[PDB]
Design a protein around this ligand. Structure first.
Ligand code: ZN
Ligand code: ZN
Lengths: 197, 197
DNA sequence: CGGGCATGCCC
DNA sequence: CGGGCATGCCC
């Protein structure tokens, strides 16, 4: 069986979608999201808020898993891991894991025994009784350019909503560039899309 | 006592000097030496020949030690080591050592018990009975830019001629930039010296 | 090969 | 903060 997890969007019967905060115009804004490119540009180790939107209320015990995969065919079959430098200069998160969660008391970090892929899971909590979404705070512990890790290869983060029995209820994904200057780099990429895409 | 080794030139009673091969004009020549800057520009893990010149013949049992130090005050007191990536993706040389020697059957790699500095030592052999110098082949296992290692800080390589009793007979040093394009980068630096130095 | 993009950092 | 150098890599 394949060790490449699926990345296909499956908004599913709960109408699961992700949302992202608007950000300021700064060259080096800490986290910014491009809707045109479905891509988050963010700094390493800094907070990246991701909203979970649903139309119907998931069952008790639903879980939210995040996993990184390389976006291009060239590396899709390789596990995305933290580079040796940021592993050394590393809480609960194992030091080889790229994605950490902040702000949650029931995070689990998983290393798949068969595929060796890392993921990090938190309980699904429904929005607070006005809010329309639930926010989870992720961090990415390397820049996309880290040699010996991502090494300039783009990743997708895949966010799956799973029930406690393991059924896939919903799946969404977004591309990530972890970088020193998220505002510069988002604008560059959007302009490249318009000119050459 | 100070854990910063001396870097002062001491050509000493044997008239010890270093020499370096001339190289071609290629942007990405593997090894090239600037006399104006007393600086070797070279690629990582590739052969860097360094000649030892003496006016008088060192005693039997003389040893040739090479050691890297950071050239600037900012890092001079820090030990120069291979970055975590090139340590992982690593023979006789310990994987934390930046400088390796090729082509010699009696290399010793040393980790100083007091200063924690690395060095690599080979027996001094007098030139073959026409030659005027003895060549040792070094390699540097990271680029000067490796994050988690040199991290763009310039190094000096200090080459000492020592007798078997430990007396310092001679000392010379040269700056090193380990880089993808030694020819480009040597020309850049020489031009910066002329314009702004 | 040499031109020119890349992208964390300038200090 | 935004301009612009850095430097391994383009694929
Ligand atoms: Zn890293
Ligand atoms: Zn290195």
């Amino acid at each position: 069986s394949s060790s490449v997890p699926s990345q296909k969007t499956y908004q599913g019967s709960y109408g699961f979608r992700l949302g992202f905060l608007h950000s300021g115009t700064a060259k080096s804004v800490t986290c910014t999201y491009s809707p045109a490119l479905n891509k988050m540009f963010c700094q390493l180790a800094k907070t990246c808020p991701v909203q979970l939107w649903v139309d119907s209320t998931p069952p008790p015990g639903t879980r939210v898993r995040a996993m990184a995969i390389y976006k291009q065919s060239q590396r899709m079959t390789e596990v995305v891991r933290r580079c040796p430098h940021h592993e050394r200069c590393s809480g609960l998160a194992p030091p080889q894991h790229l994605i950490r969660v902040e702000g949650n008391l029931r995070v689990e970090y998983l290393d798949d025994r068969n595929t060796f892929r890392h993921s990090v899971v938190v309980p699904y909590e429904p929005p607070e009784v006005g809010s329309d979404c639930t926010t989870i705070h992720y961090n990415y512990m390397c820049n996309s350019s880290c040699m010996g890790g991502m090494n300039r290869s783009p990743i997708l983060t895949i966010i799956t909503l799973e029930d406690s029995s393991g059924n896939l209820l919903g799946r969404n994904s977004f591309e990530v560039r972890v970088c020193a200057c998220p505002g510069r780099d988002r604008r560059t990429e959007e302009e490249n899309l318009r000119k050459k895409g």
